[PDB]
Amino acid sequence: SRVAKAPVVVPAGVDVKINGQVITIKGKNGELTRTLNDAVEVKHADNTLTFGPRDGYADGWAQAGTARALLNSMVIGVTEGFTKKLQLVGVGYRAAVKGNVINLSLGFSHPVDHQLPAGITAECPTQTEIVLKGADKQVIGQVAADLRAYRRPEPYKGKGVRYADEVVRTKEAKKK
Amino acid sequence: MKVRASVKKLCRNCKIVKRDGVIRVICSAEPKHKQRQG
Amino acid sequence: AKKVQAYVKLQVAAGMANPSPPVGPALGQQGVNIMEFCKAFNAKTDSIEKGLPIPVVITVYADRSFTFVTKTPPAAVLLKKAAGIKSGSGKPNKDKVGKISRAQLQEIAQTKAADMTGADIEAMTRSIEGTARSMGLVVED
Amino acid sequence: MFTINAEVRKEQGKGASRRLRAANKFPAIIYGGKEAPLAIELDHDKVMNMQAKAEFYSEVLTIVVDGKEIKVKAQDVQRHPYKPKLQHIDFVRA
Amino acid sequence: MALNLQDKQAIVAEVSEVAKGALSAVVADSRGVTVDKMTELRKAGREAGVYMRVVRNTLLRRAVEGTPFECLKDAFVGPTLIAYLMEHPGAAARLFKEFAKANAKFEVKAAAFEGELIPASQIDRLATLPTYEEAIARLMATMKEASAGKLVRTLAAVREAKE
RNA sequence: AGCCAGGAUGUUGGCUUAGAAGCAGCCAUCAUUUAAAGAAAGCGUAAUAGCUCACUGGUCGAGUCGGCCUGCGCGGAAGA
């Protein structure tokens, strides 16, 4: 239903290596990328990718919508690639990136070097911001969550590693 | 959070999802509305 | 106009400008002096009379003092000088207190010329039609 | 609008009666006039709809036996002790 | 609200401002503020009034489909977000300016003035209307004929031709 | 359902009000501006607030909302 129904359209580029039940997309950037499916029969045909269920599967659609979804972010994956961005709040917090391993400093009694995964790179436009692009939505999302983890944002002064798409509650102390 | 025999959505931004065999309540506004088991 | 930059409205009476006991250190603190809020106020306040409410905006920038531009007063306070009793609410609609009709407060709905979102000169009469009912004052209209 | 059909009950006793409401049907009787009373079974979910409209007790009613129309009035209705469902309805050929 | 009984309402009722319509303007207001109603409604104070309405009814299917009162070429005239405006009393001048000299000052898009009824055409604003009751525009309009239009050239040979 | 916009003006409503200008408060909830905006939902004021809700417009375009009668399951559910 819906998201599933809705076609995916393979932009001018990406090859679409639909091999039986293993789909692979490669283009602009992004070292290919390919995932597996299950109760959804996908069809290339013309200039798009259609997603539907399969007889005898109550998962149908449900498994198909996530299908669309994934592939749809796989196209754009290699296409425009995927964004990111995080910003360190708090005096003494600093990012670095001196390779593909980010070196963070968060008020601990030690540095915190963090090695980037496979197809993911990052830059520190500022001593307190981190932008890491990649074609795999599922991994940038992670690497982000992971970096942040080292020092989430505490609800008092707000210090810590936040995104930008945050909200940061923040409240007052117990009165006197 | 708070584990009660009856979960119930209190707030308007309080959600109710079933992660695993467990019904829980995810209230985005107030953490105090975070609940498990039910 | 734009939206919001800096402005409020706290006062008791024009009979006594820049009150000392009332608001006190609560009459402007972001570019507002307390010994100057009586040199730009009474500059035109003493041009009509003293003893009626006078709220106003407070255009603030970052150049020492400030600048304001007030306008028509509330038609609720005019019930202590142009209507009846000294007070107002207190005894709401539990027993017919004072009583104002079609005649009274008539021209009090004529003082706010430019300040009346009631285009229809006639319809703009329905607006103040309540600035004398916040305490129960049946109209003999 | 009140028009409901049924079938001449082939049985009786609380037996058939409990088998009726069991299969989403229910007993009903039609008496009055110089005509001898008649046993009927109506489809519950249908008539449960009509009994809702406050009009079901005023504007005369009409029955259909093997397609023969009778028309009567909702004389007496037995409801269920604790659930919104019918038990049995009396009908008079008036 | 209400279905057809209410839908038909917003139609004819306001579509009367189309059959017997003075002027006509179609302006979208993406990102409109309250000043939007503190302007066309404010200028209604000491220079207008309840003689103007911009009832955002671009329901198209309601606004457009709801104009059997001859307004052809409009099967196109009713795109996306809209906020039609019409007049009953007064002339058919000014009005265009309330928009032309407002929306030109940011105040959200102005549908680039897609033009409306009266002559019944397309897009490309005019202004040969607001010049009305500004009769003095018909006064100097003679450019003194003999005078000015002369003292501007026939006597420009001295302050611009003696070399 | 998202997403895009607005939600004021009479009004700072007067009031037991130290100061309350919708919201610890009292009694009241009426009338314009409009497509819609309640003296009104919440966060929270030294107090205005900043900033978001009912409700209306736009985008998208086929279904969507919740009760009733029934069948089978989930949590509740810790011990030597």
CATH of the domain at C78: 1.10.10.250
Question: According to the entry, how was the structure determined?
Answer: X-ray
CATH number at residue C34: 3.30.1550.10
Q: How far is CA E28 from CA A87, E21, E51, E96, E107, in A?
A: 38, 19, 20, 14, 11
Q: Of C62, C6, C66, C63, which is closest to residue C34 (Cα–Cα)?
A: C66
Residue D46: which residues within 8 A CB-CB, separation 6 or more? D4
Q: Of D2, D8, D9, which is closest to residue D66 (Cα–Cα)?
A: D8
Which run of H or of E encompasses D42?
A: strand D38-42
Kindly state the greatest CA–CA separation across chain E: 82
Both C29 and C67 in one domain: the answer is yes
How far apart CA A114 and CA A120 sit, in angstroms, is 12
Q: Which two tokens stand for residue A65?
A: 């919508």
- Nearest 5°: CA angle at A45, between A42 and A49? 45
Residue A131 pairs in a beta bridge with A123
Q: Of A130, A77, A73, A135, which is closest to residue A105 (Cα–Cα)?
A: A130
Q: How many CA atoms lie within 13 A of D94 on its CB side?
A: 9
CA-nearest residue to C116 within chain E is E45
Secondary structure (DSSP) of chain E: --SHHHHHHHHHHHHHHHHT-SS-EE---TT--SGGGTTTTTTTSTT--TTEE------TTTTTSS--SS-TT-SSS--SS--EEEESSS-SSTTHHHHHTTTTSSSS--TT----TTTT--S----SSTTTT-THHHHGGGTTTTSTTTTTTTT-SSSSS--
Task: Look at residues C55, C71, C87 and tell me which one is the last residue of a structural domain.
Answer: C71
Q: Of D81, D70, D68, D57, which is closest to residue D29 (Cα–Cα)?
A: D70
Both C50 and C115 in one domain: the answer is no
Both C26 and C82 in one domain: the answer is no
Residue C72: which residues within 8 A CB-CB, separation 6 or more? C111, C112, C113, C115, C116
Both C1 and C57 in one domain: the answer is yes
- E149-155: which pairs have CB atoms within 8 A and are 24 or more residues apart? none
Q: What are phi and psi of A59, to 5 degrees?
A: -80, -25
Number of domains in chain C: 2
How far apart CA C34 and CA C28 sit, in angstroms, is 8
Strands (E), chain E: 25-26, 52-53, 84-87
Domains along chain A with CATH numbers: 8-80 (3.90.930.12), 86-162 (3.90.930.12)
CA-nearest residue to C123 within chain E is E50
Residue B18: which nucleotide is closest by CA–C1'?
F74
If 0-12 CB within 10 Å is exposed, 13-18 middle and 19+ buried, where does residue A3 land? middle
Q: Which of C112, C117, C126 to mutate to test the interface with E (most CBs of E within 10 A)?
A: C117
Residue D78 pairs in a beta bridge with D88
How far apart CA A79 and CA A25 sit, in angstroms, is 10
Q: What are phi and psi of D78, to 5 degrees?
A: -100, 115
Q: How far is CA D16 from CA B1, D11, D26, D27, D79, in A?
A: 56, 6, 9, 9, 18
Residue C80: which nucleotide is closest by CA–C1'?
F14
Domains along chain D with CATH numbers: 1-94 (2.40.240.10)
Q: Are A52 and A40 in contact (CB under 8 A)?
A: yes
Task: Look at residues C71, C103, C130 and tell me which one is the last residue of a structural domain.
Answer: C71
Coil vs helix vs strand at D27: strand
D42 CA → F68 C1’, Å: 19
E100 vs C: CB within 8 A: no
Q: How many residues does chain C have?
A: 141
Q: Gaps (C–N > 2.5 Å) in chain A: which residues precede them?
A: none
Give me the A residues in range 146-175 that sit within 7 A (CB) of strand F.
171-172
How far apart CA D18 and CA E47 sit, in angstroms, is 81
How far apart CA E118 and CA E74 sit, in angstroms, is 12
Q: What are phi and psi of D23, to 5 degrees?
A: -100, 30
Closest residue (CA to C1') to nucleotide F61 in the complex: A2
* End-to-end C-alpha distance for chain C, whole angstroms: 39
B33 CA → F78 C1’, Å: 26
Secondary structure (DSSP) of C3-55: S-SSEE---S-TTSSS-TTTTSS-S--SS--SSSTTTSSHHHHTTT-SSS---
Residue B7: which nucleotide is closest by CA–C1'?
F75
Q: Of C25, C42, C31, which is closest to residue C67 (Cα–Cα)?
A: C31
Both C65 and C93 in one domain: the answer is no
Residues in E touching C114 (Cβ below 8 Å): 45-46
Q: How near does any CA of chain C get to the CA of E152, in Å?
A: 43
Q: Are E117 and E108 in contact (CB under 8 A)?
A: no
| Strand F within 7 A of C56 CB | no
Which run of H or of E encompasses A94?
A: none
Both C46 and C35 in one domain: the answer is yes
- Dihedral angle, C-alpha E32, E34, E37, E40, nearest 10 °: -60
Q: Which two tokens stand for residue E138?
A: 């018909």
Instruction: Specify the resolution in Å.
Output: 3.1
Chains D and B: 3 or more CB pairs within 8 Å of each other: no
Q: Of E133, E48, E57, E42, which is closest to residue E95 (Cα–Cα)?
A: E48
Both C1 and C65 in one domain: the answer is yes
Q: How far is CA A116 from CA A26, A98, D79, E62, in A?
A: 21, 11, 72, 56
| Strand F within 7 A of C36 CB | no
The neighbours of chain A, by the rule of 3 or more Cβ pairs under 8 Å, are: none
Both C59 and C18 in one domain: the answer is yes
Q: Of A163, A145, A137, A150, which is closest to residue A85 (Cα–Cα)?
A: A163
Q: Of D93, D89, D76, D90, which is closest to residue D26 (Cα–Cα)?
A: D89
Chain C residue set in contact with E, beta carbons under 8 Å: 1, 113-114, 116-117, 119-120
Q: Are E1 and E65 in contact (CB under 8 A)?
A: no
The neighbours of chain E, by the rule of 3 or more Cβ pairs under 8 Å, are: C
Which run of H or of E encompasses D88?
A: strand D86-92
The total of other beta-carbon atoms located within 10 Å of residue E51's CB is: 14
Residues in E touching C1 (Cβ below 8 Å): 35, 38
E2 vs C: CB within 8 A: no
Q: Which nucleotides of chain F are near protein (any atom < 7 Å from a CB)?
A: 4-16, 19-21, 26-37, 39, 44-51, 56-59, 68-70, 74-77
Chains E and C: 3 or more CB pairs within 8 Å of each other: yes
Q: Which two tokens stand for residue E97?
A: 């300016």
How far apart CA A149 and CA A161 sit, in angstroms, is 8
Nearest to E44 among C1, C114, C119 (CB): C119
Q: How far is CA B8 from CA B13, C57, E95, in A?
A: 12, 47, 57
Q: Of E64, E67, E36, E41, which is closest to residue E52 (Cα–Cα)?
A: E41
How far apart CA E17 and CA E53 sit, in angstroms, is 9
Closest residue (CA to C1') to nucleotide F68 in the complex: D84
Q: Gaps (C–N > 2.5 Å) in chain E: which residues precede them?
A: none
Residue C22 belongs to domain spanning: 1-71
Q: Are E110 and E27 in contact (CB under 8 A)?
A: yes
Q: Are E91 and E135 in contact (CB under 8 A)?
A: no
Inter-chain touch C119–E41, beta carbons under 8 Å: yes
| Strand F within 7 A of C89 CB | yes
Both C82 and C140 in one domain: the answer is yes
Q: Of E89, E90, E86, E97, which is closest to residue E130 (Cα–Cα)?
A: E97
Task: Look at residues C36, C71, C106 and tell me which one is the last residue of a structural domain.
Answer: C71
Q: How far is CA A169 from CA A148, A155, B1, B35, in A?
A: 16, 6, 17, 19
Both C32 and C78 in one domain: the answer is no
- DSSP-derived letter for residue A4 is T
Q: Of A61, A54, A123, which is closest to residue A95 (Cα–Cα)?
A: A123
Residue A48: which residues within 8 A CB-CB, separation 6 or more? A7, A8, A9, A10
Both C66 and C42 in one domain: the answer is yes
Q: Of E27, E16, E38, E39, which is closest to residue E88 (Cα–Cα)?
A: E16
- Dihedral angle, C-alpha B6, B7, B8, B10, nearest 10 °: 130
Rg of chain E taking only CA atoms, in angstroms: 21
The total of other beta-carbon atoms located within 10 Å of residue E87's CB is: 21
Q: How many CA atoms lie within 13 A of E93 on its CB side?
A: 10
Residue A76: which residues within 8 A CB-CB, separation 6 or more? A82
How far apart CA A10 and CA A76 sit, in angstroms, is 9
In this structure, which amino acid lies at residue A45? A
How far apart CA A50 and CA D73 sit, in angstroms, is 60
Q: Of B16, B18, B38, which is closest to residue B26 (Cα–Cα)?
A: B16
Both C58 and C106 in one domain: the answer is no
Q: Which two tokens stand for residue D8?
A: 């001449």
Q: How many residues does chain B have?
A: 38
